[PDB]
């Protein structure tokens, strides 16, 4: 649990972006968009 794709809205409190790939939720608080680093 806690895997979001690019362009999707993820929360940095329980359901963050997808790890291992390199995504980042912007702003993320409470939730942001998962962008590739």
């Amino acid at each position: 649990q806690g895997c979001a794709f690019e362009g999707e809205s993820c929360n940095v409190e329980f359901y963050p972006c997808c790890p291992g790939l390199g995504l980042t939720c912007i702003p993320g608080n409470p939730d942001g968009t998962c962008y590739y680093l």
Side-chain angles (χ1 to χ4, degrees), residues 9-29:
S9 300
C10 87
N11 308 260
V12 299
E13 299 279 270
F14 41 91
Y15 200 97
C17 291
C18 278
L21 311 165
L23 280 297
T24 179
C25 247
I26 309 298
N29 291 270

